[PDB]
Amino acid sequence: QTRTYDGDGYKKRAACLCFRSESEEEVLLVSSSRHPDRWIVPGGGMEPEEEPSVAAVREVCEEAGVKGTLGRLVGIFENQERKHRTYVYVLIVTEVLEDWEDSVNIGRKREWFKIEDAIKVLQYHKPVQASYFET
Ligand SMILES: O=P(O)(O)O[C@@H]1[C@@H](OP(=O)(O)OP(=O)(O)O)[C@H](OP(=O)(O)O)[C@@H](OP(=O)(O)O)[C@H](O)[C@H]1OP(=O)(O)O
Ligand SMILES: [Cl-]
Ligand SMILES: [Cl-]
Ligand SMILES: [F-]
Ligand SMILES: [Mg+2]
Ligand SMILES: [Mg+2]
Ligand SMILES: [Mg+2]
């Protein structure tokens, strides 16, 4: 549970764009913990000495209950307002697990979205997460 930081003091995070298939047309979002009627891209803090790709896959399993085939690093995205820096990877989902950690613990929800709908629901409070899909 120990948070880690870059040398500028930004929190180190990792996340995946969890796609339903190699066509990358539908992505899995999860509910916000603060505001459960909102959607976010699953992700979270890198542990000490943890590789970003390992952190990304681990947080997706914890938060979204999925596993799959890790793909490319999309990019490294800074949130200046919230002082964090996130490595974002593609993950092609191959396993959808029931009763996952955040479902059991906080009633976290998950849902598939077409890319243009994911961008729409992320824009108001997670505009940097909406920018993950730009490329
Ligand atoms: O609970 P999570 O994992 O979904 O994500 C929370 C961040 O957790 P994050 O996803 O970065 O980490 P993890 O708990 O490892 O997933 C947390 O970050 P932190 O303050 O470091 O706890 C941040 O708190 P902030 O400090 O006010 O920015 C919250 O806003 C954010 O909540 P959300 O985006 O509404 O779901
Ligand atoms: Cl898809
Ligand atoms: Cl963000
Ligand atoms: F977490
Ligand atoms: Mg988490
Ligand atoms: Mg998180
Ligand atoms: Mg975490």
Numbering used by the authors: 8 to 142
Any passages from the paper?
To determine structures of TvIPK products, these were purified and soaked into crystals of human DIPP1; this experiment does not exclude the possibility that a substrate yields multiple products, only one of which is captured in DIPP1 crystal complexes. We suggest that minor conformational changes are also required to rotate the plane of the inositol ring by 60° to establish catalytic productivity for two substrate configurations that we have captured in our TvIPK crystal complexes: those for scyllo-IP5 and scyllo-IP6. This proposal is consistent with our demonstration that TvIPK pyrophosphorylates the 3-phosphate of scyllo-IP5. In any case, these data provide further validation that TvIPK selectively adds a β-phosphate to pre-existing phosphate, and thus exclusively synthesizes PP-IPs.
We have biochemically and structurally characterized a minimalist inositol phosphate kinase (i.e., TvIPK) encoded by Terrestrivirus, a nucleocytoplasmic large (“giant”) DNA virus (NCLDV). We show that TvIPK can synthesize inositol pyrophosphates from a range of scyllo- and myo-IPs, both in vitro and when expressed in yeast cells. A crucial arginine residue in a conserved “G-loop” orients the γ-phosphate of ATP to allow substrate pyrophosphorylation.
